[PDB]
Amino acid sequence: DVEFDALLGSYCNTLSLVRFLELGLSVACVCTKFPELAYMNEGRVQFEV
Amino acid sequence: DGTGISLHRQLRAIQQLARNVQAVLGAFERGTADQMLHVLLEKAPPLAL
């Protein structure tokens, strides 16, 4: 008596990768890379109007 | 069923049959030896007597 057991075709989704600036909201922030930030111990931003 | 599985079945059946048919035919070839001994032992008087 010959009886097998079958794997019928496994499946995978893909994580979609978004970029933010490609987003409608990719705006609203001015992200700038900053390397010594580990070091900086108080950054200030100044304004005059 | 006209499929690969429904044949290797048959192949495995044909093969057991041939294995039994061959065992019973060679049984009569040994049945004559076992048979012969009993008719020779039936009439052998002990040598002592």
Task: Provide structural commentary.
- The structure is cut from a larger assembly and holds 2 copies of chain A (49 residues).
- Chain A has no helix or strand.
- Chain A is largely without helices or strands and 49 residues long.
- The interface between A and B is small, with 3 and 4 residues.
- Chain B: This is Major capsid protein.
- It is classed as virus.
- Keywords: herpesvirus, atomic structure, virus.
Question: What is the structure about, briefly put?
Answer:
This is part of a larger assembly, with two copies of chain A (49 residues). By secondary structure, chain A is mostly loops.
Task: Tag the structure with descriptive keywords.
part of a larger assembly, 2 chains, 49 residues, little secondary structure
How big a fraction of the residues of chain A is strand?
under 5%
Radius of gyration of chain A: 26 Å
The chain pair forming the largest interface, with residue counts per chain, is: A-B, 3 and 4 residues
Oligomer: part of a larger assembly
Structural class of chain A, please? little secondary structure
General shape of chain A = elongated
* Biggest sheet architecture of chain A: none
Work out the number of β strands of chain A: 0
Task: Give the SSE map.
This is part of a larger assembly, with 2 copies of chain A (about 50 residues).
Chain A (H helix, E strand, L loop, with lengths): L49
PDB class: virus
Keywords: herpesvirus, capsid, cryo-em, atomic structure, virus
Entry title: Atomic structure of the herpes simplex virus type 2 B-capsid
